[PDB]
Amino acid sequence: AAKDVKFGNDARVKMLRGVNVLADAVKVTLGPKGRNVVLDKSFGAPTITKDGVSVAREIELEDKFENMGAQMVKEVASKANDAAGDGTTTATVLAQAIITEGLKAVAAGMNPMDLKRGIDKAVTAAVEELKALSVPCSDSKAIAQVGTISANSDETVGKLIAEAMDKVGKEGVITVEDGTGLQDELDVVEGMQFDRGYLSPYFINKPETGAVELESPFILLADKKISNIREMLPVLEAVAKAGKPLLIIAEDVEGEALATLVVNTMRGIVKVAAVKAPGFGDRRKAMLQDIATLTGGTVISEEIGMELEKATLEDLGQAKRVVINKDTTTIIDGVGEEAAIQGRVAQIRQQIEEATSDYDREKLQERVAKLAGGVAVIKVGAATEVEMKEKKARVEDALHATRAAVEEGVVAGGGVALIRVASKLADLRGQNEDQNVGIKVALRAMEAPLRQIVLNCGEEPSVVANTVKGGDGNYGYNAATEEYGNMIDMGILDPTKVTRSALQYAASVAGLMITTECMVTDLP
Amino acid sequence: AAKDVKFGNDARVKMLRGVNVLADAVKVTLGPKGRNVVLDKSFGAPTITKDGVSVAREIELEDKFENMGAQMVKEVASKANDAAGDGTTTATVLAQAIITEGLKAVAAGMNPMDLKRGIDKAVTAAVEELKALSVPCSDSKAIAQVGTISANSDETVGKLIAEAMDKVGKEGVITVEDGTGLQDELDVVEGMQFDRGYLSPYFINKPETGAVELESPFILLADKKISNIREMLPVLEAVAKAGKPLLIIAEDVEGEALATLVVNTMRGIVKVAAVKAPGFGDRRKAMLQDIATLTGGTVISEEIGMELEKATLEDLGQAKRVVINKDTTTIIDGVGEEAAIQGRVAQIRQQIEEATSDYDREKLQERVAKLAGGVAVIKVGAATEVEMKEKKARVEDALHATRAAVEEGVVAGGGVALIRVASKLADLRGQNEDQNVGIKVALRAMEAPLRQIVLNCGEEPSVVANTVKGGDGNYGYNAATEEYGNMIDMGILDPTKVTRSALQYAASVAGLMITTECMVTDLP
Amino acid sequence: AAKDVKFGNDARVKMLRGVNVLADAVKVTLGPKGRNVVLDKSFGAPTITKDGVSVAREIELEDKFENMGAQMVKEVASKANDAAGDGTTTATVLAQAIITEGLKAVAAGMNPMDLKRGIDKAVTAAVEELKALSVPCSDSKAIAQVGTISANSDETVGKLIAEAMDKVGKEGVITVEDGTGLQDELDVVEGMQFDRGYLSPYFINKPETGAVELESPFILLADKKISNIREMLPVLEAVAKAGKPLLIIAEDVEGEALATLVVNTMRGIVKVAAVKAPGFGDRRKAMLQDIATLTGGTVISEEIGMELEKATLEDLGQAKRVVINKDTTTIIDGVGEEAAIQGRVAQIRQQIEEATSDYDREKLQERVAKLAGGVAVIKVGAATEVEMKEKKARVEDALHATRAAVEEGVVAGGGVALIRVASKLADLRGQNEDQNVGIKVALRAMEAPLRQIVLNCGEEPSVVANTVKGGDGNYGYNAATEEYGNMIDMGILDPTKVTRSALQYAASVAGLMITTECMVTDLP
């Protein structure tokens, strides 16, 4: 494949145009009074929406290079949401902001290396400011507080959320399942979770969630890497006639067996999916056992000669539910006997006796939690199935922000937070004058979001922005009501975490480009 | 296939444009403060990086001819790393440097035959200078020294490395495996290695390494060349239901049986690989046997009537691990009974009694080494699987430089070494004036690396360069800190070996071109 | 197929451009200080080389006609080598030389018929001169002499070569096999050779040699023409399970059976080959019998009813090796019992008793030779496998020249010989003035090689050429050292045979063209 290569401006310019489209197309949907975009559908009527994430999703340009520029942003803007639950759009909005100016500068003659530096500083600083401005969120009050707000005023919601964490704790594992009747339900059941994503997106059965929800399937707990499909045939056929799904946990899976399942499911008879096992090496040993214990399943160790072909359902584990996302597996309600489960706990507990290390003691501990801790669940109750699954959505949302709000507190959410922080460090200087500009850009870029909202609401950006600078603290303008005040009291906020994330990620990608001198790709 | 043919300049010019792209695209990533390039991925998000090696890898031009020029460099610049562990980029950088000027010259009217000559001299000379400036690296101090440095300050690293060599010797065979826990582990075990690479890149299972790591597979010890696949069927199916990989060692393998395996593995059931046997003729005889012993396997000799179809696992050898690269195989931990191995030693040892030659005594000896010498292993301990495998990486790196550092010592690593040597032999003249020029180009080309770094850091090349010339010895400029001093004391150096290699290879290819008068290739 | 037709110039001009490319591209690599050409490779890195033969190989133009002109040269230039072991390039160079001028002439108005004539005379004459200049090569001194020289100074080489011939005679049959150890080995063994080449290029398993080396394969001694594959199945299958190669010898083979084996081998199970039988009619009878005896194989005569389906391994013959080329087959070490062989001799010897003719006696004689004469083999000893097979190469080289040297002595080899002879017959006139010119062209064309070398070395052609004309005998200029002297004493020579060959062949094709008036080919 002969490539097409561009340098300096030629390169950067393309990337710029590229990004812009993305931004210009996704930014118009920002405020609570955002405009809408039309996403043409292949089959049928087009789709109208104001959801930037969706918009962004569809964006892909013909001009490679320009297209790269776009994808480069989308990527990190996604990562932002990935690690905060929102911002996806905002990050993009800022991303442009920076890139645009900083990219004129480089092209104006100014040194890029510094520009980047200047910015990073600005960010770095503002990030602190954010920490300052942030308002703690600890008590079940603060908790239900934010919840209901992010749940859109709905108090019942924030409520459960607070109750929840009040049960399995703030770090506890909470989940959501459609309600069976009209009543909401909160139950705590033997469960567990760990960071480990599916080995194939083609496993997803919940497109809008990019997740995989399975119904009380069986569970496999291998001890080797699974490359060849042969070993499965026995069990794989057992669960086939068992009429239930099946989850797998082991070292890993080579396409041979992997690529097969993927297809075997994506429009195939038995539909199942699998994910690596948590921890590595000596750790994993126990780690998987804990799981066995909990799911009442048998662990197939080759270090025991027991092979996969040598395995029947009696050897599998089982839970009532289980979901997987891009990088996290969690199981609900393990059939494992309390006698068994609890006992295991004793075992471990004991083991923590050695305490030969605050790492080993900390490790055993962590397992104790996962296993003894449990997983709390919720069942969004509702009248109609619509409101039902709808409500269920808002919930999962709120839950997010809340965890975040908890982690890093919260701040003014109309893009306010940024405006504030900016006006703060408005003197902040750098060595090279090229760094000052670097800083300006950064700062002036933080005005973007707000200005954009105002704009999308058909209001005067410059004007609103100004008066917002005047005030202090979480004093801002509520675009949705056109009334200024305490954005937070007015129930308009953003988990400190996300705002930061967004801003950092944008800065990240920005300098990244500002320092890019070459671009390679295929020929048209 | 009707070819397209160009001569003299027509040829050379294309070659030049060709090279430049490669260099202009890979050189921006040189300094510690290098810029980054964006490599477009077919599926998904583009890739940003500052790793020249990666960049280079992706480079391929549409214009054949121009594309040749590029591949021609890539080739030798690769060979450089191949025989030094780094420089890949640098070599390239210099490559251009020379090529550019010397190619204008030829095109200016000057004699090419001389220009080349003039250069080679300059190189020749500078190579010596390097020997001079080169600071030895022998004691375990200098070893863990350089190691911990190339490992990026991490002293724990340079440590194990010194220990290692301190175990199986400087020439001993050291390997690396992921750590089971958090602790690093250094163990010596019955193992071996020999210069013989895979007979198919399509065997690689470690892309970024271009290596084939196999998990305690079975081993084959044939005694013939293998063309037809038949013979395997018995065993090939045995290790199939054995669920383990398998390694082969014999005369060689014709596509018939070879090509089949290639596919058989690249997206195939039983995934395995094979390599030629060390030594030739009478030599190989014992050679292989030695291995058998170590692996506890049986050698299938046709000179015994024994055939492959006539073979069961009881004849395969075994080692917990084994890895192959472009041109070198190495197995780890042979299951052969110590009684056996050690016994075999006795045999050979005695055999050295003949001593009927310092080649035969030398030979028998070497074998004694491989076998009884053993192979040292290292398990990179770490908290996280990320860091873990990450750290593991840096290790293998350091190890490299070290081996090289040992072989030839080390020198100033900021391109410094070159600047130095250049300013040194700055009078150096040649017969034909076309040789002086030849020499200049050469020398002035040595300033390339440094200047480029300075450049990439957004600093004044000409200026830094100058002041570096001023000082002497290993006195240079640390681009990462913007402070001049003892590049070596500042922990900034390069294994004498690599710098030379790089420089020699660059010089090689350059003249090669400068003396190229014709170019053949297919038609667009 | 509608053709495209050109006449006179239209035709000749195309041929000219055609030839030029070939020559301009291959000539640059003539001297010991030749420049190099780059031969693009489909997969991977391009190839750099200074080997005309290779370059030539790759040459094929898009413009049919022009392409023809090229191919026409290549063909004969190859034949040259074919019948001398070198010159391939040189021939081409001269080829151009003549063609260029003489073709201008025809196009200038002069008569073609004479031009050709005029040249042929010049050649004719110069060929004699060459005989004069030629210095014999007979005693084992001159023999080891020239060998070691062509072997590139390596005396050890020229040694064995002299020894060899010193064994089975100058006309004896000598071969080369890789050495088993480090020591060189010369052995005489029951074996034989005869002028008969493979019936398919797709048998070559030794590309760079265009040879077919087979390891101790079985041997078939048929008596009819093999058209149908059937007859083989019994035996073809026995050797399939016997796991060894197989050779055939009979009347001939029709695609039906032929084309099948071709593919059967080229990427196929059983991989073997076959060549026509020595002698025609009455002669072939005995002939094959002699072979049978030697290999201990059975002769399948249809004049005995015995068919091929009616034949087992007990009927095949065997030799430890056997190699075929474009037109010569030779077997090594036939299992035939000495009692049998030596006995077969007694038989023949007697038969020579008849002496009824000096053709019949001569013939019976020859057979005696082939059989009892035996085949001298050599085993290039070497440290490394590289050097080994490498050295092995140079050997075969030397051997060639030596044979030729023997046949016609040797001469100055820097293109010297030609310059000499040229300056000699510098008056030589012709009838038609168109013939004088014919003669000039010819002569002036002999300066080509030398001039080209000097040129490639970056030296003054005109000048050196001049001073060489000045001297006499084998006094020439060594381009490699830039020192004039006795080219032969300086170890720079050419088997009288080759020089001639080259020169004649070039002359051949040249006039051939000069006398061409029409050209036919397919349409673009």
Side-chain angles (χ1 to χ4, degrees), chain B residues 388-402:
Chain B
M388 195 295 80
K389 297 178 296 182
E390 188 295 298
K391 182 176 182 179
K392 177 184 176 182
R394 290 152 42 191
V395 182
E396 300 165 300
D397 296 352
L399 187 164
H400 269 302
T402 305

Side-chain angles (χ1 to χ4, degrees), chain B residues 252-266 268-297:
Chain B
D252 202 297
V253 180
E254 286 57 64
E256 176 173 356
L258 188 164
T260 56
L261 291 176
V262 180
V263 186
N264 180 301
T265 61
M266 57 168 294
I269 295 182
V270 181
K271 206 165 303 179
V272 301
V275 297
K276 288 162 287 58
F280 53 108
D282 311 299
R283 236 70 82 291
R284 78 179 202 298
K285 293 287 68 178
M287 291 275 56
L288 185 64
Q289 178 54 293
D290 296 50
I291 295 180
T293 304
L294 171 54
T295 68

Side-chain angles (χ1 to χ4, degrees), chain A residues 94-266 268-281:
Chain A
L94 292 162
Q96 186 190 205
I98 304 174
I99 301 180
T100 309
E101 294 304 77
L103 227 45
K104 297 177 175 183
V106 296
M110 285 156 285
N111 175 306
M113 229 53 188
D114 294 306
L115 296 180
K116 177 180 164 62
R117 198 166 304 175
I119 294 178
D120 304 309
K121 189 178 184 180
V123 178
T124 300
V127 185
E128 248 53 15
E129 293 290 58
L130 237 61
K131 305 184 177 298
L133 182 56
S134 179
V135 179
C137 179
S138 181
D139 59 6
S140 301
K141 169 185 177 302
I143 304 303
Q145 181 70 65
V146 36
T148 62
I149 307 165
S150 176
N152 185 185
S153 309
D154 185 311
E155 296 182 56
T156 74
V157 184
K159 175 183 179 178
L160 292 65
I161 310 181
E163 302 180 56
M165 306 181 61
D166 191 58
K167 280 283 189 177
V168 65
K170 298 185 180 183
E171 278 53 300
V173 180
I174 305 67
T175 62
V176 183
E177 314 170 4
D178 297 54
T180 61
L182 168 55
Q183 289 297 60
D184 292 351
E185 290 178 293
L186 188 178
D187 301 294
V188 296
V189 63
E190 299 297 302
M192 171 190 297
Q193 173 193 295
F194 56 64
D195 301 0
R196 222 71 175 192
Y198 53 68
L199 287 59
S200 175
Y202 295 58
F203 282 163
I204 298 181
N205 62 308
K206 294 298 178 181
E208 277 300 62
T209 310
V212 180
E213 299 188 62
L214 304 180
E215 297 304 7
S216 57
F218 301 72
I219 309 168
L220 186 293
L221 306 180
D223 182 57
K224 71 177 182 183
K225 296 76 175 182
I226 309 304
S227 57
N228 196 307
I229 324 69
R230 189 189 292 77
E231 311 82 298
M232 288 47 280
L233 309 178
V235 293
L236 189 58
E237 183 183 0
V239 301
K241 300 183 299 182
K244 296 182 181 178
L246 178 284
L247 179 287
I248 304 174
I249 294 184
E251 291 286 359
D252 204 303
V253 183
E254 281 57 58
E256 174 169 353
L258 185 165
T260 50
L261 287 173
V262 181
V263 182
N264 181 304
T265 62
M266 62 173 296
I269 297 182
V270 186
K271 202 171 304 174
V272 299
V275 302
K276 293 161 283 54
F280 53 106

